[PDB]
Design a binder for this molecule. Structure first.
Ligand code: ADP
Ligand code: ADP
Lengths: 213, 213
């Protein structure tokens, strides 16, 4: 059974603002999610300095992007620290985020939407290209859980009994908007990645599917 | 909870014979599994002639090969008819297979191991390159289940609560032997596929993972 939680009011406002904005540089969402992925990998690496066993659940440290055309889904995965059930509820919704209102006010003043990451709310930039998202996470400290949101005022968290097992890490499963399907294309994904992410310490793997000739 | 079943005696013998054989043309396993995949796709397509709704669980008809290096696993997937729990138990183990003893006798006489498919036991050719296998299947008529074998005399069947959801079809998850890791390599997989499978009516998709430069 899934559990439902209410988003902190300002986060709901931010999501409404982002999913509805006609901003032109929507591709910035990838830079933000890749940055969050890198941060998660930094955390597990750092924790492992004094607790090496933490790495054993998934020795490979990577960022992986997997387009799923049929389902019109784009997945951004990392083998970082991951999030326990409590962290998913805490970090992605119920607790007030310092930069939320600040960013919205900056936006009103004319600030570029690309500043979202500097305000600490880059995760929500995903709503620039997706109308729904499932965050699948496995922290060494908990079971695998699924957090899901459609930019509405509430989200759900469910023990994961339906997705592939993640050794450790997080998968941002984006259900792309009908007019943003270009982010399923290899060429497009490649140019966006090369553009705003040259100094990422981890390999960024793109999963490509080709018909054998 | 998993359930354990005993293999029909002759199948156990066949598996022992195959996993231990020093045969040189081990690559034939791919041709056999791709053939079984094509057959499964033929079945759902045919059934759909009088029951079109059967296709809706997964409209795309394909064969997909996905190497998973870290886990030393190679997956062969199809969106065919799939197998219900009863079919997995029935079709892959507990029931006597007509060609089992016949093939073993042919083998003793000098027959090429590649004849395995003509005897109707091509599925077991997978033990030429793997010491363990999980068959994940989803038939429109049942839930998703996992059948698992290590070539021993018994196998297990478990309701699937750990793998990605298959719309419909089957995944042969092969845990490759340490000296057969060449089948994780794109170039190698490509040449084997092009060699013994030119007349397959369905697209054969290879999932490749590359680091973004
Ligand atoms: N890939 C991830 N792995 C682990 N935690 C994440 C991931 N993405 C987001 N989070 C968590 O949820 C929070 C919300 O994301 P975000 O608004 O972008 O925060 P921040 O700007 O501090 O990265 C993060 O602070 C982080 O704790
Ligand atoms: N990919 C698959 N999809 C559905 N059923 C399969 C698949 N692979 C094997 N089977 C089933 O298990 C049986 C055992 O496989 P195999 O020995 O190769 O049989 P056959 O030679 O008749 O294909 C098959 O007859 C078939 O019913």
């Amino acid at each position: 059974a899934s559990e439902t939680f209410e988003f902190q009011a300002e986060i709901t406002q931010l999501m409404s603002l982002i999913i509805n904005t006609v901003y032109s540089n929507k591709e910035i969402f990838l830079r933000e999610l890749i940055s969050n992925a890198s941060d998660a990998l930094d955390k597990i690496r750092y924790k492992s300095l004094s607790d090496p066993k933490q790495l054993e659940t998934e020795p490979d440290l990577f960022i992986r992007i997997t387009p799923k055309p049929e389902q019109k889904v784009l997945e951004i995965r990392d083998s970082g620290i991951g999030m326990t059930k409590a962290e998913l509820i805490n970090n992605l919704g119920t607790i007030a985020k310092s930069g939320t209102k600040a960013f919205m006010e900056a936006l009103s003043a004319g600030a570029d939407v690309s500043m979202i990451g500097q305000f600490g709310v880059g995760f929500y930039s995903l709503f620039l290209v997706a109308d729904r998202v499932q965050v699948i996470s496995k922290s060494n400290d908990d079971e695998q859980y699924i957090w899901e949101s459609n930019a509405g005022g509430s989200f759900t968290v469910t023990l994961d009994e339906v997705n592939e097992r993640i050794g450790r890490g997080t998968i941002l499963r984006l259900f792309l908007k009908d007019d943003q399907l270009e982010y399923l294309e290899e060429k497009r994904i490649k140019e966006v990645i090369k553009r705003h992410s040259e100094f990422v310490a981890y390999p960024i793997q793109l999963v490509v599917t080709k018909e054998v000739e």
